[PDB]
């Protein structure tokens, strides 16, 4: 009767809506995962550039120490 | 069929649960990466600040030669 | 169950992740510029050091 | 309550990502600071190279 028909229709409507909604949520999730992984990889690349940069600053400090030895040699005339 | 919807919801909820775990791992990995880079950037900034003073000072000694 | 409430939360999360990615990408040029300035400086300091070494031998 | 439980998981990732955005904003500022310092460093290195070239010329001519 009418009560049965309402309840059957409602259960189906709700199941369809829940399937659709959770599918939309899953799609949002997967796209966020794709973006997050790509951004993580970009961050890691940027760290490699910073690490190389630190080696170059260390190199300049070494070269200034060599330069000071040359200055001392040049001043040592006698 | 109702059963097909229930089946789809169940698999969606499983995949959401697993995927949110993977997102948490990604987000924590970013957090760790940023912390590590903060350290590198701090040390790099300190070394550049000292190096600029040291290059200028060395140049002024070379001027006297 | 009312699962539609989860959608709004995931939209918010998605926006954070997208914003984070745009910010990381926007900082690429600062990192490249730092690296380039330091590379140039290192070439210059190496060349200066080599000139002082030559003068020390003359 | 399954909806509330998944919502709590989303909220946990959101909290970490909110902190990640705060910290990456700070990183961008620290990078801008460092970029300016390395610009100045590059200029300083040019002075050092120029002065060292002038001294090398001087000592070359002193020694014929």
Curated annotation (Swiss-Prot), chain B:
Full-sequence range covered: 194 to 258 of 258
Cellular localisation: Cytoplasm; Golgi apparatus membrane; Cytoplasmic vesicle, Autophagosome membrane; Cell projection, Cilium membrane
Role, per record: SNAREs, soluble N-ethylmaleimide-sensitive factor-attachment protein receptors, are essential proteins for fusion of cellular membranes. SNAREs localized on opposing membranes assemble to form a trans-SNARE complex, an extended, parallel four alpha-helical bundle that drives membrane fusion. SNAP29 is a SNARE involved in autophagy through the direct control of autophagosome membrane fusion with the lysososome membrane. Also plays a role in ciliogenesis by regulating membrane fusions.
Family the UniProt entry places it in: Belongs to the SNAP-25 family.
Name of the protein this chain belongs to: Synaptosomal-associated protein 29
Subunit structure: Forms a SNARE complex, composed of VAMP8, SNAP29 and STX17, involved in fusion of autophagosome with lysosome. Interacts with multiple syntaxins including STX6. Interacts with EIPR1. Interacts with STX17; this interaction is increased in the absence of TMEM39A. (Microbial infection) Interacts with Hantaan hantavirus nucleoprotein; this interaction prevents the breakdown of the viral glycoprotein N by virus-triggered autophagy.
t-SNARE coiled-coil homology domain segment(s): 3-65
Top-rank taxon: Eukaryota
Tissue: Found in brain, heart, kidney, liver, lung, placenta, skeletal muscle, spleen and pancreas.
Associated pathology: Cerebral dysgenesis, neuropathy, ichthyosis, and palmoplantar keratoderma syndrome: A neurocutaneous syndrome characterized by cerebral dysgenesis, neuropathy, ichthyosis and palmoplantar keratoderma.
Annotated organism of origin: Homo sapiens
Residues modified to Phosphoserine: 11, 17
From Swiss-Prot, chain C:
Modification after translation (UniProt): Dephosphorylation by PTPN2; regulates exit from the endoplasmic reticulum.
Location(s), subcellular: Endoplasmic reticulum membrane; Smooth endoplasmic reticulum membrane; Endoplasmic reticulum-Golgi intermediate compartment membrane; Cytoplasmic vesicle, Autophagosome membrane
Residue ranges constituting the t-SNARE coiled-coil homology domain according to the UniProt record: 1-55
Family: Belongs to the syntaxin family.
Known function: SNAREs, soluble N-ethylmaleimide-sensitive factor-attachment protein receptors, are essential proteins for fusion of cellular membranes. SNAREs localized on opposing membranes assemble to form a trans-SNARE complex, an extended, parallel four alpha-helical bundle that drives membrane fusion. STX17 is a SNARE of the autophagosome involved in autophagy through the direct control of autophagosome membrane fusion with the lysosome membrane.
Quaternary structure note: Forms a SNARE complex composed of VAMP8, SNAP29 and STX17 involved in fusion of autophagosome with lysosome. Interacts with VAMP7 and VTI1B. Probably interacts with BET1, SCFD1 and SEC22B. Interacts with PTPN2 and ABL1; involved in STX17 phosphorylation. Interacts with COPB1. Interacts with TMED9 and TMED10; the interaction is direct. Interacts with ATG14. Interacts with RUBCNL/PACER; promoting targeting of RUBCNL/PACER to autophagosome. Interacts with VAMP8, SNAP29, VPS39 and VPS41; these interactions are increased in the absence of TMEM39A.
Protein name: Syntaxin-17
Gene that encodes it: STX17
Curated annotation (Swiss-Prot), chain D:
Keywords assigned: Acetylation, Antiviral defense, Autophagy, Cell membrane, Coiled coil, Cytoplasmic vesicle, Endosome, Lipoprotein, Lysosome, Membrane, Phosphoprotein, Protein transport, Transmembrane, Transmembrane helix, Transport
Phosphothreonine modifications at: 18, 38, 44
A single GO BP: symbiont entry into host cell
Gene Ontology molecular functions: chloride channel inhibitor activity; SNAP receptor activity; syntaxin binding
Entry membrane topology: Single-pass type IV membrane protein
Compartment(s): Lysosome membrane; Early endosome membrane; Late endosome membrane; Cell membrane
Domain v-SNARE coiled-coil homology: 2-62
Membrane-side (Cytoplasmic) residue stretches: 1-64
Tissues expressing this chain: Platelets.
Cysteine pairs bridged by disulfides in the record: none
Site positions for Interaction with STX8: 23
PTM note: (Microbial infection) Stearoylated By S.flexneri N-epsilon-fatty acyltransferase IcsB, thereby disrupting the host actin cytoskeleton.
Modified residues (Phosphoserine): 8, 45
Keyword Lipid metabolism listed: no
GO cellular component, one term: azurophil granule membrane
Lipidation ((Microbial infection) N6-stearoyl lysine): 54, 58
Main localization, broad class: membrane
Family membership: Belongs to the synaptobrevin family.
Biological role stated in the UniProt entry: SNAREs, soluble N-ethylmaleimide-sensitive factor-attachment protein receptors, are essential proteins for fusion of cellular membranes. SNAREs localized on opposing membranes assemble to form a trans-SNARE complex, an extended, parallel four alpha-helical bundle that drives membrane fusion. VAMP8 is a SNARE involved in autophagy through the direct control of autophagosome membrane fusion with the lysososome membrane via its interaction with the STX17-SNAP29 binary t-SNARE complex. Also required for dense-granule secretion in platelets.
Protein name: Vesicle-associated membrane protein 8
Organism whose genome encodes this protein: Homo sapiens
Residues of the full protein shown: 11 to 74 of 100
